[PDB]
Structure 1
C-alpha cells in the first residue's frame, strides 16, 4: 500500500492523519482445461470485463 496524499490536523499533543491510500489486493482464479484465458498479461479490466 502507498499513501497518495496526507492531510493532517493538530489537536492536543497528537496528530490525526487523513490518508488517501491506494493499494491492490489479490484474488486467485483457477482455470480448467476446458477454459481459455481471453486476457493478455498485465491488461486492465473493468467491472463486467471477461477474463476467462
Structure 2
C-alpha cells in the first residue's frame, strides 16, 4: 500500500493525519478443466469484465 496525498492537522501535542491510500487485494479463483481463461497475464480489468 502507498500513500498518495498526505495531509495533517496540529492538535495539542499530537497530529491527525489524513491519508489517501492505494493498494491491491488479491483474490484466488479456482479454474475447472471445462472452463477457459480468456484474460491474459497482468491485464487491467474493470467491474463486470469476464476473466474466465
How many correspondences in the alignment?
52
The aligned residue for residue 45 of structure 2 is 45
* Alignment of 1:22 onto 2:22: yes
Structure 2 unaligned segments of length 5 or more: list them. Answer: none
* Alignment TM-score, normalising by the size of structure 1: 0.96
Q: CA RMSD in A?
A: 0.5
Structure 1 unaligned segments of length 5 or more: list them. Answer: none
* Alignment TM-score, normalising by the size of structure 2: 0.96
Q: Deviation at 1:41?
A: 0.5
